[PDB]
Symmetry: D2
Subunit: 335 residues, 4 copies
């Protein structure tokens, strides 16, 4: 009858997905996190260093989290197979722990009673979607587990779609200047799988690998072989920026680029891709719900066919809203 949502992992994304659900009237029926009990959940949800105090009521009772008088069941189980999703009636599940990324890992949610899973990160094998770019590729009859890609992919892909469709991208290389995240360390500590990521997050500019640019070629297949990139993690707690250097097939004077993006933002990519000519900086996008905000004045062209395009994204807040948008879209298709 209605979209209902379960959240596994009540972290930055989990908690802000709940905020976005409340904002968009999406019913959340349960949250699972073995490291956060109901009373502690109230505290973590209510106070946020980055996005301020929750505007509304947050309480706990009867083993439940209660937000704006909406009662939410709280589970404390460590593995998807163990979560009693059936107890709250076959919800759509957001998998936002960061550690159950494969179809096999996520499918345990379905076994445990979930109707669908949205993995809030790229997956090695789950079908990947970026709202505004390829959500139409979703087939309810054949797909119960999907990925909403990464924050960076959701920033680049809408922009790349507009630029490629208007001018043709011959080749492009991306850099994201990216806020630090929960995977990083306060001071130099162990990060066996990726040594640089262990170094103090607040002290350093840290180069990092990312598949985000290549992932864009998954949701825009015409761009296979034509995009890749990397990241720098820097000492800001939220908001990131994509820096796309691309060679274009058709001449693209910068004024034409601006008109193409502005047209997309006003029309078919409204709410996903935005456009600004203001003298903005990263904090100006705290709480912004867009996937991608094109920065007209920040970019620079060498010539009509070789340009550097700049687009902002609140990697926490924009992405969380896209998770909710994908859920709502999936539900609209699954009737």
């Amino acid at each position: 009858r209605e979209l209902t949502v379960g959240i596994n992992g009540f972290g930055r994304i989990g908690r802000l997905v709940l905020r976005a659900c409340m904002e968009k009237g999406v019913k959340v029926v349960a949250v699972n996190d073995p490291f956060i009990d109901p009373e502690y959940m109230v505290y973590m949800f209510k106070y946020d260093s980055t996005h301020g105090r929750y505007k509304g009521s947050v309480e706990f009772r009867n083993g439940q989290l209660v937000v704006d008088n909406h009662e939410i069941s709280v589970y404390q189980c460590k593995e998807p197979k163990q979560i009693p999703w059936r107890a709250v009636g076959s919800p759509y599940v957001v998998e936002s722990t960061g550690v159950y990324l494969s179809i096999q890992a996520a499918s345990d949610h379905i076994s445990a009673g979930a109707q669908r899973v949205v993995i809030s990160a790229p997956s090695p094998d789950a079908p990947m979607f970026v709202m505004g770019v390829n959500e139409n590729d979703y087939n309810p009859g054949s797909m119960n587990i999907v990925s909403n890609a990464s924050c960076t992919t959701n920033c680049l892909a809408p922009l790349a779609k507009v630029i490629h469709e208007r001018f043709g991208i011959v080749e492009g290389l991306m850099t994201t200047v990216h806020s630090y995240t929960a995977t990083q360390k306060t001071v130099d500590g162990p990060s066996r799988k990726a040594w640089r990521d262990g170094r103090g997050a607040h002290q350093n500019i840290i180069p990092a690998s990312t598949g985000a640019a290549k992932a864009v070629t998954k949701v825009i297949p015409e761009l296979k072989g034509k995009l890749t990139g990397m990241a720098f993690r820097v000492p800001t707690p939220d908001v990131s920026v994509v820096d796309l250097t691309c060679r274009l097939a058709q001449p693209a004077p910068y004024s034409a680029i601006k008109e193409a993006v502005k047209a997309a933002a006003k029309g078919p990519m409204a709410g996903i891709l935005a456009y600004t000519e203001d003298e903005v900086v990263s904090t100006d996008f705290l709480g912004d719900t867009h996937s991608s905000i094109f920065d007209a004045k920040a970019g620079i062209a060498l010539n009509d066919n070789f340009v550097k395009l700049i687009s902002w994204y609140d990697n926490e807040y924009g992405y969380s809203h896209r998770v909710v948008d994908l859920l709502r879209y999936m539900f609209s298709r699954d009737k």
Copy 2:
């Protein structure tokens, strides 16, 4: 014949204790850390965001860490009982993992072949020592496991000793404005045992409990019931400052306070307590080996009997040097 040292936990303290050992000619025969293999140890030891590149050679071979041509065995075991300390001849062990704080937990090192253990943190029951204040209380014949207290206790106790012995402390309350540490989080995350400590370390001033002031009354028994305090964690990666507000029994004009501290620094507390009248800030003490650096100009008196005294400490580097000093002292007593 000679002091030999094993380090359990190759973290901020573990690695800087190794630096201090190399600087002071103390032989380190082994390091244990299940999360850092020899090649990775080379990297973590060589590069440091806070204290710069190691000045010397760092290599690995034959399963060993080699620093300035000194070969160091590397073990990868998760529990003290499992570490083959016997294989490197009954070393003195630095327990710097942060999770084996009790006499019972640390005693497994002895069972595994260690001759002594120095816990690099306060212990609920191990005898506690602050160099320059009460190391004489150490008895080799009855004590195989000891604690070197905390960075903050090592800052406050030498100062409190000088002030109490000259003027008499009637009562005192301490605040430490303290750099963030590895126990904290880059962004708002779970900290069940202490909620505030979960909040983003780089964004916040964070109140925290600390037993450091009360611990001073353990090493200066005359001050039992007369000292306690608390902490603020702030967005700096290293160096902290003690803020001691105390009522004194004898009149203590600030000039007399300065002369007492200066006399102690030049004489019996040389190398432990230092004295400055310069316009210093926290970064000026990066790499400082003193336990406590009295800041003459920063303090303020209401009157001759009620004063606020300020003292700096490199919570990483000073403390690591005191660990080494305690080891050397213990060895000198144990012959």
Copy 3:
């Protein structure tokens, strides 16, 4: 018939005083700042790194700043004597440049047409006020020029008043752990009058002198000779915290301290002094309009007569709201 406000200095306080005026329905008729033209004022007012985008419309036309359709004259003169306050009909002027602090300096506003002046900083000779503590000492007949004291004094004085009147303060020493401000430097630079203040604000814990605690004894004369203190500037961009260590005459068990502050917050100091028992950190007070938020759990007592009390303040936002409250109060009295 109505209060009208002119703002000299469109900085952090000037701009946030304008926000507070909009929030409280106070008519602002002019802003003077020689370094910010109308178009640039729009930008600086609309976007804020700390307090977010202005929720409303901001535009310029006809040499005026227009906020939520309210037309505001913009002047560009470098000295108070030169500002054409008469052109907007004898406004109450907020002096928030930071460089006209004396009665003599500020009085040039009056000669230029201002009805009254509120200096948004302590003054060497202008009478100082803290709302909720001594505004009733305002005398319209004789006080054309007043001072709203400092952010820190507005935090400490309400708390000091409650504690003194309930328990009697014998003596106290204050530390404020304080966010950096516009007077500080991004990297080590010149600060002739105060050397430590030149050192990089984002890298350092910086001791600083402040007259804030002594200033409390001016607005609460019964505390003359009983308070002083100092500051540490730390790497946060806004929100600060008072750390008051005091000796009390009457027995002051911490439970009794909490009931006294709670009662004050609910009654005579409502909207000025708040009370919390939550596990708060500095960012939880971004945008808070209170002068002082008592942190029950952060404080610690040595005994019934010697305690450390902790209270938060948004040094930008709370203080700006108090400027507006003082303006409104003065106006109601000048009738």
Copy 4:
């Protein structure tokens, strides 16, 4: 007979140029700065938040700054014409105030007695030099006033030269992720000429214009029309990184790119361009004297003819050392 140096502007570059002079045995005979007297110069030179305490003696007497027993005259004049350079016998002058960038402005140093001037910043008309790239274009007879370009240009040009001469650069776009500097603000403040630069430096990723990439085409004329770029200022106090995305004429497999850079670093560009394959982050280059350190592992190729190349630089320290190198080179040529 010998090189003697005068420094105008005792800021980050002025002070670290003095450090580099001491390190390289270059005689500094005078420093001019109207905002820093001899006693204050001692303090600012001795203590450094970024690069640590000066390892040596620093004192003042007889109106002079004395470093390692070298007596340095201290002048306090506000304009180049007014500085008594003649009193110290026709020194080579480093113009590091940031406000005398043209040949016309800087030439007043010559009228005041200077032998030559090195502007420590790009100039609109003074010839620009990058050591290791085009110092041989220096012509003593006709060039009294020169520019050492920018920190960023000194990073990019050596790399661009190596890559162009080996593979041929068809076109390239540069981003520098750059530490904040003294021109920026601690909190949102006025920056009329460049609005984004006024926004809080420690809170924001800040896009900025830079002519650095185009400047490379001035010192490497064969690249005219083939390079431009932009900057992001981020919350680190020192060390920056160049991100060069270029299209290459000859096939440039990444292995061949590494051999070309490595060979340059070992030979013709030794001490200017370095090469590393370690997992480095920005703080690992604090105090590094190279203009450019190529980060082999950080870069990524889309294909053999389209690559992203990453190179580090200590924008303060490396550049200061290059100023000294240019002075010495000019002197050897003026003989």
